[PDB]
Amino acid sequence: MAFSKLLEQAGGVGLFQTLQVLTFILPCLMIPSQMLLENFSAAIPGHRCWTHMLDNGSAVSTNMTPKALLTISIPPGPNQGPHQCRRFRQPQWQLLDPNATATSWSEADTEPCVDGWVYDRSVFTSTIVAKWDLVCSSQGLKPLSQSIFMSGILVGSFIWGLLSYRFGRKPMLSWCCLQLAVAGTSTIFAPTFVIYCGLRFVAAFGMAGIFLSSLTLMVEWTTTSRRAVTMTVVGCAFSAGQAALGGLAFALRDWRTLQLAASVPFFAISLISWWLPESARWLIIKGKPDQALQELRKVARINGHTIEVLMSSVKEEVASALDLFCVPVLRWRSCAMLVVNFSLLISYYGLVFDLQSLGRDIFLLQALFGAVDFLGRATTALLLSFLGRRTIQAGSQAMAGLAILANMLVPQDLQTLRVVFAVLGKGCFGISLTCLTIYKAELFPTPVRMTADGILHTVGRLGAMMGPLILMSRQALPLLPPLLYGVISIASSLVVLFFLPETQG
Numbered sequence: 230m231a232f233s234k235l236l237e238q239a240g241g242v243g244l245f246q247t248l249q250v251l252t253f254i255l256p257c258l259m260i261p262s263q264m265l266l267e268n269f270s271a272a273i274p275g276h277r278c279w280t281h282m283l284d285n286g287s288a289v290s291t292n293m294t295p296k297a298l299l300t301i302s303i304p305p306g307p308n309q310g311p312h313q314c315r316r317f318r319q320p321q322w323q324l325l326d327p328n329a330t331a332t333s334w335s336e337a338d339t340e341p342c343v344d345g346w347v348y349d350r351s352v353f354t355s356t357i358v359a360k361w362d363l364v365c366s367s368q369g370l371k372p373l374s375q376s377i378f379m380s381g382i383l384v385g386s387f388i389w390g391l392l393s394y395r396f397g398r399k400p401m402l403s404w405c406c407l408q409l410a411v412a413g414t415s416t417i418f419a420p421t422f423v424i425y426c427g428l429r430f431v432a433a434f435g436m437a438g439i440f441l442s443s444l445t446l447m448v449e450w451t452t453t454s455r456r457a458v459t460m461t462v463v464g465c466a467f468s469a470g471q472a473a474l475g476g477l478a479f480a481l482r483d484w485r486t487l488q489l490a491a492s493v494p495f496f497a498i499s500l501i502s503w504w505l506p507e508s509a510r511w512l513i514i515k516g517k518p519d520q521a522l523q524e525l526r527k528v529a530r531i532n533g534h535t536i537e538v539l540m541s542s543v544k545e546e547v548a549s550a551l552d553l554f555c556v557p558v559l560r561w562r563s564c565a566m567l568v569v570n571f572s573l574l575i576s577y578y579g580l581v582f583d584l585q586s587l588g589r590d591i592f593l594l595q596a597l598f599g600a601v602d603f604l605g606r607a608t609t610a611l612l613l614s615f616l617g618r619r620t621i622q623a624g625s626q627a628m629a630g631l632a633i634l635a636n637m638l639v640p641q642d643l644q645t646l647r648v649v650f651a652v653l654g655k656g657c658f659g660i661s662l663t664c665l666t667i668y669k670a671e672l673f674p675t676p677v678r679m680t681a682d683g684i685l686h687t688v689g690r691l692g693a694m695m696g697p698l699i700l701m702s703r704q705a706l707p708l709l710p711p712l713l714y715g716v717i718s719i720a721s722s723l724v725v726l727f728f729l730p731e732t733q734g
């Protein structure tokens with residue numbers, strides 16, 4: 230750990246580290262708005278088929294109320310309202326006499342919606358759903374779009390992982406900011422949903438590069454004693470951005486203006502990120518010690534206070550920089566950690582992307598999700614001060630699964646209690662995630678802590694990709710996604726009890 234001593238000698242607690250954290254707070258504040266945008270920009274408004282008798286103003290007989298025309302023009306659907314995707318071929322005038330038994334019409338009188346849809350614009354002025362008619366049959370493309378975005382983060386993280394050995398961390402950060410900004414603003418001009426999804430993929434690829442460069446540069450320029458505090462501050466910045474998205478969507482409500490508000494700040498952040506210095510340690514490993522020493526002298530000058538000694542002192546640590554699968558105890562602990570992290574991230578992203586189903590007011594729910602993650606972190610710290618890691622992890626993940634199942638049990642009325650259970654489940658996943666982040670570091674020794682974290686992270690992003698894809702199944706079985714998230718959360722809590730060891734703590 231000789232580079233940490235060099236950073237201490239360079240002033241590991243100076244003005245530079247604060248300015249660096251603030252500079253990285255800007256993208257961590259803005260990333261949730263881009264990542265979770267589709268909860269608002271792809272909100273499904275109330276909709277029905279266009280029908281000549283109801284929607285062509287020249288055919289509206291002056292003597293009928295719009296409610297009567299709706300009743301005679303659209304059959305009741307499974308839920309308490311007009312059926313969203315089908316109309317009668319001819320107006321069923323027989324359906325207006327109050328003495329007619331409600332079964333006088335057949336399914337044979339219905340057809341799929343052929344002439345498109347008329348959307349209620351009272352709640353949302355425009356969505357991508359209303360732009361490309363993604364309902365009843367095409368409803369799977371929204372969570373598919375979110376899944377494509379998560380796949381963009383996965384592929385980006387992999388490709389940028391490989392490219393990070395050759396290419397530098399400052400220009401990669403700048404390029405990824407520019408790429409995300411350009412692709413994000415370009416999405417408003419997409420003529421087809423396919424072009425939209427492709428631009429979202431390219432945006433997520435850039436976001437993946439943002440995540441990699443920000444975390445790597447931050448850890449590499451923060452001393453080990455401060456890494457945990459800095460990571461906590463970054464988590465709080467992420468949570469502030471998550472809360473701010475609810476207010477931003479409340480402020481504009483137009484998907485195009487919201488997309489601009491999410492994408493243009495990454496244009497502004499790219500130039501500031503261009504001001505940032507490159508990693509001196511990376512420069513050393515690449516065999517560029519003169520530039521690394523120049524960067525150390527620049528940082529030490531900015532924080533307000535010799536050659537050959539630096540590179541010689543860290544030679545062995547750079548030089549030093551399998552048993553996990555052959556050895557049965559490690560095999561089983563590894564497998565357990567992959568299943569738990571996979572099931573956790575599947576349920577976390579299922580919940581965060583399921584916003585329109587969890588509450589009628591998605592803006593309040595998003596704000597509460599940020600507030601309760603903050604509250605969750607404060608109590609995770611309290612729980613860790615009183616209790617142990619395994620019990621809190623298992624209990625929190627079980628409470629999250631129970632909260633999802635309870636949400637499935639809540640009638641549409643009493644919206645506040647449904648919001649309470651959804652917010653509780655989100656908070657529980659926030660605590661479980663922070664516990665898991667600590668517990669991974671405590672369970673694995675450094676050579677395999679590092680080997681394990683790469684595979685765990687890639688399996689977790691696979692989980693993140695699988696979340697919205699399971700959410701796609703709602704069109705056939707509406708109760709299946711939250712049921713799955715509940716049962717998988719409970720089952721992985723059982724995995725924790727049976728398969729993870731008790732530790733010294």
Ligand SMILES: [Cl-]
Nearest residue numbers: 382386440690
């Ligand atoms: Cl990632």
